Design a protein around this ligand. Structure first.
Ligand SMILES: O=C(Nc1cc(F)c(F)c(F)c1)c1ccc(F)c(S(=O)(=O)N2CCC(O)CC2)c1
Ligand SMILES: O=C(Nc1cc(F)c(F)c(F)c1)c1ccc(F)c(S(=O)(=O)N2CCC(O)CC2)c1
Ligand SMILES: O=C(Nc1cc(F)c(F)c(F)c1)c1ccc(F)c(S(=O)(=O)N2CCC(O)CC2)c1
Ligand SMILES: O=C(Nc1cc(F)c(F)c(F)c1)c1ccc(F)c(S(=O)(=O)N2CCC(O)CC2)c1
Ligand SMILES: O=C(Nc1cc(F)c(F)c(F)c1)c1ccc(F)c(S(=O)(=O)N2CCC(O)CC2)c1
Ligand SMILES: O=C(Nc1cc(F)c(F)c(F)c1)c1ccc(F)c(S(=O)(=O)N2CCC(O)CC2)c1
Ligand SMILES: [Cl-]
Ligand SMILES: [Cl-]
Ligand SMILES: [Cl-]
Ligand SMILES: [Cl-]
Ligand SMILES: [Cl-]
Lengths: 142, 155, 150, 148, 148, 155
């Protein structure tokens, strides 16, 4: 099956890709923000919203991936190739989860339309060369 | 955070653990069934239901895990070590996803109540030694909400 | 082009794929059944139905594959590899034709909706581990005025 | 069973054989014409016509025959015996599929009666010796309901 | 993105591909025809039509492609390498622009629906073997009360 | 023939030249923005506007140049030269295409009159020596949909 996790939320993988990689916080900083803002809702027996349902699964999936990556790095054929599994996480699946976690956390905080407008505003601003770019980035606010 | 993926759906990790591991189809057989029964809804731009939203993420998460496991296994010279990665998937994260996929797929067809009643019925039947247990396992189906006498009375 | 031969019949290659390979009868047995049930219609100068048209072509296509396999094994090969090519055709493309012949024969015999519901029922049953699986498979089957008694 | 693929379409294998082998377009050109003129209909979930059903199957069957002949050519370790398989295909089943693809594509494009009348006209004209044969071939010239 | 340059003009890349490569004029002859028939319009500050807008860009793009292909051809030392590049251009982007320039020039000159009907007619005619093909290609182009 | 691709749009090559070369985004960033903002219109069977028709052709033309330059590079004997022809294209026509893609994308987003006024404003600002140049560049922004006069009229 070819599922786009953003599609039921009015976005697409291609649109999230318009943000540069270094826009996103780390997964750890995203997970700490999800707890600070939504821990009680995420841990409750209520659905709350489709964003909460999706965010719950993503949090648990990152736990699955890191447990697997930890086992690989620890019970290893080599020494110091641990650096290799880390690099794959940083390059590949870490970026996917930074996009996804940022998307759900921001939509819960600012609303989908505000988030998507900001995404396009920032993506255009950051691609404007510094010769022309206004000094302050667009603002994400309700 | 300590999130139980079943809690918003009226169940718990411990309850799903009551089914034995060899009750569940493989992840592959579950994913092929999810596609045969629900592909169009899963791929659509509509939420459809909280079970659909959760099932979408679980399908994608399995892809993430297998891609990671494949990259590791492919970049391993020792073929016995590739067999270690497969065995780790089979022993640990495969069973979690067999439980989770089975739960959402079955709930989407039969409803939470029927599924949880069946889970408990099967878990009790399979723990009964075979001399005492009827030869046929409990059946998974939604029981009629009313008797035939009740149905006819309200015609 | 990207033609799916099931699409005009309300199905897809991927849906037929949901049945395991060992569900389908052999090609020989499918061709025997097509003859026993439908020979006169298949040989008639009438279209009869889209299923009949498709089934005619499928039967002839299998004939083309077998004729080619045999001519290659007969005219050329040693006696030992006489059946080598027939063996490849049955291995690779046999499953595709077992699916296709089964679909049209069963649709003609039981109706499309009955067949498609049975297909999904069987695919779920067979993926249920035998610990939990009821012993009997799902069944493929199809189903006076008051004045008379006054 | 004895199935003639043309019988439900009002023709026969023997009638298509009345056209000389070099009358028919190549398989490549027939497949490109089916795509250029009918790709959307052939790929649609609608039956459209008995010709569409036959064309769908014939197109897919040709693909299978090509995979089979290729496997034969690759696994026949004698380079001369790969050459017999090719020439046999061109002489026998290649001609069968050129006939079949031509028939259905032409019926959809020019109309069934027009195709069948033209077929007989062309077959008579080409058998007329050049001492007597007019220089130009007969003329082939131009919703749909299908009874039994 | 997957942009088909013909889609906004009611055609597709696959349909233009139905014409054989030797149907099209050379690029030089297409560019001379665009100039002879449309130079003033193409050079004007008016849009004129979407065909003119597309044709302007295609003419300029071909110039860029030719400046590149020329630079490559001149700086190669081996005649077989230079012929590899010409052959690659002729088969690929050279053919694409012959198709594209022909399409817009002919739509402007003969009308769009005339062009599309003719394309399909020609593609079928040229695939008909010469044994059956008519010698000439397809053509591209009151009551009494009235007088009382 | 002497065709200026900007002439039917009320501009000229020389006017686009008034912007310095390091003003323009990279080709990759322009193509990413065209997709993010206009993919559906660009891929649709409608003309939409002369800017869309021109932008479609420019996108495809850059692709043609890159495909040819990439293929030629694959034939070069020295693997270190694999991108030599791609570099030649960027060096000789990269700026031309950055100008053209920027022009159509910005006109679709802000309107031709706004774009041309901004172009002149920026070109004058950047030529003002830094001793006198105010720190913030002119701003490129869409006109408001309704004027203050109209807003007050409907109060
Ligand atoms: O996306 C952002 N941050 C982020 C998101 C997450 F989902 C995280 F998990 C996480 F760690 C950080 C972001 C982007 C722009 C921005 F300007 C600010 S802001 O300065 O903080 N701010 C401005 C004023 C508003 O009123 C509120 C927010 C924050
Ligand atoms: O698909 C089946 N068989 C098949 C199909 C073909 F197209 C063939 F060519 C061919 F040889 C065999 C099949 C599947 C399930 C099944 F239960 C039976 S059943 O027992 O025979 N049966 C039950 C009662 C009904 O009333 C009638 C049929 C048959
Ligand atoms: O859980 C089961 N199967 C399963 C679930 C999934 F989520 C899968 F992905 C997958 F492959 C298989 C199961 C358990 C008991 C059982 F009896 C049957 S049954 O025989 O098939 N059956 C009975 C009648 C009903 O009406 C229908 C289904 C199936
Ligand atoms: O496409 C054709 N030519 C072409 C197109 C271009 F875009 C060119 F740039 C260019 F050089 C040549 C073509 C095709 C068939 C054909 F029969 C003729 S025709 O003889 O010339 N003719 C017949 C009567 C009509 O009324 C007028 C045209 C011309
Ligand atoms: O059978 C023919 N062509 C064919 C068929 C197919 F099924 C193909 F796939 C394919 F490539 C070519 C054929 C035979 C005679 C003939 F004169 C022409 S004609 O010149 O083209 N012509 C004349 C005027 C009409 O009005 C239209 C058609 C075409
Ligand atoms: O031309 C610019 N950027 C650009 C154009 C393209 F065509 C691209 F493809 C691409 F990547 C970047 C540009 C120029 C000045 C400027 F100030 C900004 S701004 O800061 O982003 N901004 C300000 C507020 C408005 O409201 C909106 C936009 C952007
Ligand atoms: Cl909280
Ligand atoms: Cl579905
Ligand atoms: Cl049982
Ligand atoms: Cl019979
Ligand atoms: Cl079509």
């Amino acid at each position: 099956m070819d599922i786009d996790p953003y599609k039921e939320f009015g976005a697409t993988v291609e649109l999230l890709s318009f943000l540069p990689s270094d826009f996103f916080p780390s997964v750890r900083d995203l997970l700490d923000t999800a707890a600070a803002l939504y821990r009680d809702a995420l841990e409750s027996p209520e659905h709350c919203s489709p964003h909460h349902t999706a965010l719950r699964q993503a949090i648990l999936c990152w736990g699955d991936l890191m447990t697997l990556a930890t086992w690989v790095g620890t019970n290893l054929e080599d020494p110091a190739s641990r650096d290799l599994v880390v690099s794959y996480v940083n390059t590949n699946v870490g970026l996917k989860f930074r996009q996804l976690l940022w998307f759900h956390i921001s939509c819960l905080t600012f609303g989908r339309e505000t988030v998507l407008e900001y995404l396009v505003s920032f993506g255009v601003w950051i691609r404007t060369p510094p010769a022309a770019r206004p000094p302050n980035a667009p603002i994400l606010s309700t």
